[PDB]
Design a protein around this ligand. Structure first.
Ligand SMILES: O=C(O)CN(CCN(CC(=O)O)CC(=O)O)CC(=O)O
Ligand code: NA
Ligand code: NA
Length: 180
């Protein structure tokens, strides 16, 4: 991997605070498109390109990465709505900062941290975004992390990173973006 920002190679000083507005939009989980085979062409390509895993190994890795029951997330400049099972839950959020994590392979990434201001947020009280960026820019897709204890609890989760792309894309278009 080239030593670029989006591959996780960046200077600490370039990491800058963001706002929830970077993530505003109507977003969909990519997991159904792994499950229905749309991403098989992605895993075949990755296996042939990098040689680091077989196609089946890549698929298992991304199955663990993408699994979630949160099928849709709708975000405004100050709210997030999670659609999960047969229920929608919407809360107001404030920005609470950022965290630089180091991964086992030696690259790094930044989590951008939000906290619900509503008392009844439960498992959606603490929410983090990772999008391979480190400073303000409109998100094009993201991984999300959420729970009800603290931001710090979520820093331990490294292998499940539910992933979201804009609702206006087909699964095929998401696959194209991943192949690019
Ligand atoms: O982030 C991904 O989608 C898959 N990552 C591994 C998982 N991520 C999780 C994260 O970014 O929060 C870590 C990473 O990309 O180093 C490998 C890759 O991008 O080639
Ligand atoms: Na889930
Ligand atoms: Na997660």
């Amino acid at each position: 991997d080239t030593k670029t920002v989006q591959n996780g190679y960046f200077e600490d000083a370039a990491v800058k605070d963001r706002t929830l507005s970077d993530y505003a939009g109507n977003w969909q989980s990519v997991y159904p498109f792994l499950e229905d085979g749309t991403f098989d062409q992605v895993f075949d390509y990755k296996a042939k390109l990098t040689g680091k895993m077989t196609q089946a190994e890549y698929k298992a890795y991304y199955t663990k990465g993408y699994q979630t029951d949160v099928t849709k997330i709708n975000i405004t400049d100050n709210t997030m709505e999670f659609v999960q099972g047969g229920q929608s839950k919407k809360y107001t959020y404030k920005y609470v900062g950022k965290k630089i994590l180091t991964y086992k392979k030696g690259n790094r990434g930044v989590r951008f941290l939000f906290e619900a201001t509503d008392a009844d947020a439960g498992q959606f009280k603490y929410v983090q975004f990772s999008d391979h960026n480190i400073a303000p820019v409109k998100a094009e897709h993201f991984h999300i992390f959420f729970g009800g204890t603290s931001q710090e609890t979520l820093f331990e989760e490294m292998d499940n990173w539910p992933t979201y792309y804009p609702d206006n894309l087909s699964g095929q278009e998401i696959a194209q973006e991943m192949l690019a």
